Amino acid sequence: GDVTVILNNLLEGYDNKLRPDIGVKPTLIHTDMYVNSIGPVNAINMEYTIDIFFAQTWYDRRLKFNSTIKVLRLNSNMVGKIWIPDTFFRNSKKADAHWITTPNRMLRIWNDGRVLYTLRLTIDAECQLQLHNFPMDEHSCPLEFSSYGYPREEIVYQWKRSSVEVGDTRSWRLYQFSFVGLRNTTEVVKTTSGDYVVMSVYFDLSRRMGYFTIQTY
Amino acid sequence: DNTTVFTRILDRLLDGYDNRLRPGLGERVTEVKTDIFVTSFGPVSDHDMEYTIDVFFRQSWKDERLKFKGPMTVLRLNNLMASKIWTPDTFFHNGKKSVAHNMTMPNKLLRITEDGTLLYTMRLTVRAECPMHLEDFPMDAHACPLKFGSYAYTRAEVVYEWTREPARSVVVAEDGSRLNQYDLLGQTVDSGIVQS
Amino acid sequence: DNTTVFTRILDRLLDGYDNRLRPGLGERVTEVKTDIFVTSFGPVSDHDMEYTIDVFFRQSWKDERLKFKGPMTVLRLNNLMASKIWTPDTFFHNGKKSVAHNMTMPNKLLRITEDGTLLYTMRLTVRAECPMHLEDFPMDAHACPLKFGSYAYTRAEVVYEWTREPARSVVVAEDGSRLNQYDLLGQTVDSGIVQSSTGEYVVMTTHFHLKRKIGYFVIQTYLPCIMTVILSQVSFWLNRESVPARTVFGVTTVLTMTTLSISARNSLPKVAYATAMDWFIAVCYAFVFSALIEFATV
Amino acid sequence: SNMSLVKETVDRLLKGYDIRLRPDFGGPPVAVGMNIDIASIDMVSEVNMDYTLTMYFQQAWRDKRLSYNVIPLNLTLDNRVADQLWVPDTYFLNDKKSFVHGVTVKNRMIRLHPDGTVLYGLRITTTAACMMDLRRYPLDEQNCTLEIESYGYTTDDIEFYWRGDDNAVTGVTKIELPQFSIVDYKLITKKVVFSTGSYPRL
Amino acid sequence: VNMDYTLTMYFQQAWRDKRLSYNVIPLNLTLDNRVADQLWVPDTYFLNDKKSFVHGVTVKNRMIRLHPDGTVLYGLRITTTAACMMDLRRYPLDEQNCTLEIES
Amino acid sequence: NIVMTQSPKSMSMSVGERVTLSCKASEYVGTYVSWYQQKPEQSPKLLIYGASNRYTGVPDRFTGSGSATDFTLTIGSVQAEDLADYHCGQSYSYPTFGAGTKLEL
Amino acid sequence: VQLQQSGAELVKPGASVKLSCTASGFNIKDTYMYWVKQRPEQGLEWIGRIDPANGDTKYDPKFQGKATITTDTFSNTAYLQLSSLTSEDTAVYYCARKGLRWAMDYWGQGTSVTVS
Ligand SMILES: *[C@@H]1O[C@H](CO)[C@@H](O[C@@H]2O[C@H](CO)[C@@H](O[C@@H]3O[C@H](CO[C@H]4O[C@H](CO[C@H]5O[C@H](CO)[C@@H](O)[C@H](O)[C@@H]5O[C@H]5O[C@H](CO)[C@@H](O)[C@H](O)[C@@H]5O)[C@@H](O)[C@H](O[C@H]5O[C@H](CO)[C@@H](O)[C@H](O)[C@@H]5O)[C@@H]4O)[C@@H](O)[C@H](O[C@H]4O[C@H](CO)[C@@H](O)[C@H](O)[C@@H]4O[C@H]4O[C@H](CO)[C@@H](O)[C@H](O)[C@@H]4O[C@H]4O[C@H](CO)[C@@H](O)[C@H](O)[C@@H]4O)[C@@H]3O)[C@H](O)[C@H]2NC(C)=O)[C@H](O)[C@H]1NC(C)=O
Ligand SMILES: *[C@@H]1O[C@H](CO)[C@@H](O[C@@H]2O[C@H](CO)[C@@H](O)[C@H](O)[C@H]2NC(C)=O)[C@H](O)[C@H]1NC(C)=O
Ligand SMILES: *[C@@H]1O[C@H](CO)[C@@H](O)[C@H](O)[C@H]1NC(C)=O
Ligand SMILES: *[C@@H]1O[C@H](CO)[C@@H](O)[C@H](O)[C@H]1NC(C)=O
Ligand SMILES: *[C@@H]1O[C@H](CO)[C@@H](O)[C@H](O)[C@H]1NC(C)=O
């Protein structure tokens, strides 16, 4: 058909080793999250589990085509053939994606070159809990991410206006804690390789003293 | 030398095939028929609020680009032909960490019918999450769900349906029960639409 | 054009090479020279009957197809040239779950000498089985084995050999001992021919001799038990006009003997025969019960 | 001489070989014979309701395309050529986790014969699940199994049988368990029927 | 009880390769990490580790940067479980010295 | 230094019967002991390697039997040309030989 | 397949001798080369060991410092040099090749060294 012609013309002379605007300006990447559940917050290992749908979107002037169709909706087959940012979570001890039954990824290219790339992640992040005032305590411990190799002058991140969305909040595995809200933050951190744009999401938790009462008090 | 004719058939089938496009991208809606055969309902970990289930997961659709005419009416091909063609990307909405078995070869099955119908079967172990309300413990009853759907394909592109009557589609085996603490009473299927 | 000559040497070296055919497929027998350098003898698990070991495993052989001639006499190549040549398929007959480390790159070494001799070294951690006989627990000595050989190559195709004198081949490092409970006395190598359903294969055997240390189990079990027996024999010096005192004496020492025996039997595995700690506890329990029956009689 | 001749023989055998098609793709079914040499039964865990066993699992069939007559001897090839031949898709229905050992290389064996016979062995450690009846525990006796089935090919495409039918499973009397004792073992041939077809089973 | 410790690190290596030298552009080139399979990197290993891995979310966590004078900068993010034997004769009033070895 | 003690020093016997020679080690030598035959005014020839492995070119009447410490060499149905010196030598460590054993008719 | 030694000779007490052993049919860089000494109607005694590929040698403690074994791969020979001779050096010296599970399968013809 014609979509094969479009995809073959888009992938001719394409080099996935170079980001768009390699010597012009930094690339702006807009990020969104959708939290399915926040798992058990065990204080032994100073960590907590989280499951999210991480979505990124940016502009690539090489993936620009002229046609009567507006959007190409694709599988994960073409994810490894174009440029994808190297986002990584700075405070994760272990994190893996999902591969059953087929790699849970999504790619969508628009008429003007805007690419949207979404994938499902399960992160086991760490947050140091100052366990004074236990069990009448409240915490707010983060999830941070940034690019690994591209400094501030090459990749800049930015939240949207509808950034983080939680689900039902009743089917979550929070036994001893209770979710109350969240807030987003952006900052710049000094590193031996350069300045990096770091984005943080703080979840505020309060411990419900409903178990420790009939356990010890 | 009856292997050259089938080699020519498979080479004419794969000449100009683009596995990045769903069948009927510009004309119709891809309709996938689903089936689940539970070979063993694994143990339910109540302390973690999750359960295990071992299934044969079967899907079937229609691809008009894989029509042929040969001496055989059904090609029972290998599990390495299913990677060169289009397959739906079904995922489990509440699955935690599932595995797809690889012993000794990839446990997959592909059958192509002469008129273009494809049957695609996998064997895999789902580990899904079951939220429980333990207010009447230990005299409680539960309904553990298993939601699956399509990633990356909306309702106007790919729709799912049960291949047989809905009451007879999910089939649990008789000796397929590794439960020690619970008692399986029955199944219950449904179909709906989520607005994401 | 300073590195073009080495690229030409490697290209002529790999031009006409089939890595599915062993050197001398219908002409000779392949001679493999083995060597083991143990960098750390890991912990010995007694409930699984296994042990861990970390080794540099070296194999040398001769391939007449890899002769070259250049300004260097030895090429110290990468770990990706080893996947383009024939390497022997050595496995461990009694291994459970071994790992070949690949941090940060695959830990493999290849050196080719100008006459065709190859040295191929790997770094790997082996978890092997050690069947123990625990009659004399905790004063027992074991010989944990480590047997390896070739998979699919019979005696008429590939034979193994030690590269140095057999008493000086398996070399253990000095700081390489992660043993808390045992003591490594020495090593012992051996060679033999096993016979299985596919033919006769050469097997190289190594034995590590371990001797358990008693200094923990003494203070743990043998000394509290004797102290409890002595405290039971203390009762023979009290006057009979205080009956509840001696009654509570007897019953609480029987209770303490029961708690020490239950708390002591979780140390060793679930063996089906009786050990020497069980004999000690049984005779001491007999002594305490005899003291109680003696009190009842008097 | 004697090496390049065999090189040409193997190159002729592997040229124009379609791995998608079984031997005698449009004809009678192919027979596959099984062998098992059990090396150890590791841990029978009541709580996990499973048991681990290590085995040398070998399969033998006949492929008329891998038939040569220039050389008279048997060919043992490197274990990486098993990714270019056709091997049956055998699986174990009741396992939970399994792997082929990979030290120092992938522990598998390929062996050709001048008439066409192929021998294909693996070294597999598998944790198979067997549900126990603990009504009479601890004074009881369990029976649990290892099931060997074909996934893709029905009973009109493949046939399974024990190679020897009484000496196919060896090494059982030399197995020492800390808690149990193997009193007896049995071999069974069968055909099962699912909603997709009829499949052979051992 | 296991006699080991776990640490996460950003491990960076810098060397100079004359073949990766260029003069037509005045800026440093940060390349996609997939090019690290087409370049020469040293075979550094840790002698006293038991289980290591490079993180893999969302891609393989490594960095490759070329400078115009030939200096290559190569970084990894590693989580190492290194092994160190402890002397517990003064437990719990003890101080333990254990180290990580970096070798070629 | 592992020493090998051979026994007996001499043995006189006729043709056709079975004869046995013994060799003992002080330390452990695990199946690495070879048996050589030396005729008068000649060089020693390898008969048995390993512990029980006939060298290619030796008759079938020689047989070796091995252990960790005690080794034996048995010759069944001797001939008139099997009279020579016989040495046992270990190779587990640096090689040491035995004193020898004369065989006379 | 064949090992050819030098010829017998006499030597005065206090001089030095160099015995040679030329290998033909194989390459000395593959195996080890042993030197053995035999007295008349006595047992064999091991002198020393050479690894021709690397070059390191070991000697019997009785002969340590007295004998020196060297090699020459060009002429395919192995040499044993004896110095500070005494009257107890009258013996037969053999040159042996290692092979087939450390067995010393191939021997030389032996040279008679006599001290007058
Ligand atoms: C030391 O050695 C270690 C062991 O060797 C080593 O660990 C290994 O790491 C490597 C690299 O990181 C792994 O290889 C990759 O694995 C990725 C997935 O990893 C997860 O899954 C594997 C098992 O992988 C199976 O399943 C996945 C997904 O289904 C497949 O992608 C794999 O190929 C493989 O599938 C086969 O088996 C299936 C059944 O199982 C069959 O159904 C199927 O048919 C195949 O036969 C697990 O083992 C992993 O667990 C471990 O690793 C994780 C890492 O997060 C750890 O956290 C965890 O603790 C475990 O240790 C993990 O769960 C693969 O996705 C990946 O394959 C793609 O990438 C490579 C490299 O770029 C490509 O060459 C390849 O083509 C694939 O790309 C295709 O797909 C992507 C999808 O996004 C497309 O975008 C892309 O375009 C491309 O598509 C193209 O090809 C398609 C066909 O394939 C075609 O359809 C398209 O049209 C298009 O042309 C790669 O295999 C390896 O698994 C690890 N091994 C193990 C056992 O851990 C370690 O790195 C070494 N360390 C060091 C420091 O050296
Ligand atoms: C998440 O980030 C967005 C963008 O920064 C926040 O939206 C802005 O919030 C600030 C402070 O209240 C306002 O002044 C801006 O007008 C908002 N719009 C934009 C586009 O900046 C949003 O409030 C943040 N949500 C949190 C903190 O959870
Ligand atoms: C699964 O098996 C296939 C076929 O042997 C192999 O290509 C693939 O690498 C295997 N997967 C893993 C994760 O080893
Ligand atoms: C090949 O194997 C078969 C069966 O083990 C055997 O009978 C045959 O002799 C072998 N090849 C030869 C001719 O040595
Ligand atoms: C490239 O890196 C070097 C080394 O840090 C630095 O001095 C130089 O300023 C960088 N180039 C640019 C354009 O920033």
Coordinates of C-alpha atoms and ligand atoms in Angstrom, one line a residue, chain B residues 79-80 100-107, chain D residues 82-83 87 106 108 120, ligand 3:
Chain B
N79 CA 7.4 -21.0 16.0
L80 CA 9.9 -18.9 14.1
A100 CA 6.6 -17.3 28.5
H101 CA 8.2 -20.8 28.5
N102 CA 11.2 -21.5 26.3
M103 CA 11.8 -25.2 27.0
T104 CA 13.0 -26.8 24.9
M105 CA 11.9 -24.6 22.0
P106 CA 9.6 -21.6 22.2
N107 CA 6.2 -22.9 23.2
Chain D
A82 CA 21.8 -26.9 16.3
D83 CA 20.3 -23.4 15.5
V87 CA 14.6 -30.1 16.1
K106 CA 25.5 -24.3 26.1
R108 CA 23.9 -29.6 24.1
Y120 CA 20.2 -34.5 19.9
Ligands
LIG3 C1 14.5 -19.2 23.7 O1 14.8 -20.3 22.7 C2 15.2 -19.8 21.4 C3 15.4 -21.0 20.5 O2 16.4 -21.8 21.0 C4 16.4 -18.9 21.5 O3 16.7 -18.3 20.3 C5 16.2 -17.8 22.6 O4 17.5 -17.1 22.8 C6 15.8 -18.4 23.9 N1 15.5 -17.3 24.9 C7 16.4 -17.1 25.9 C8 16.0 -16.0 26.8 O5 17.4 -17.7 26.1

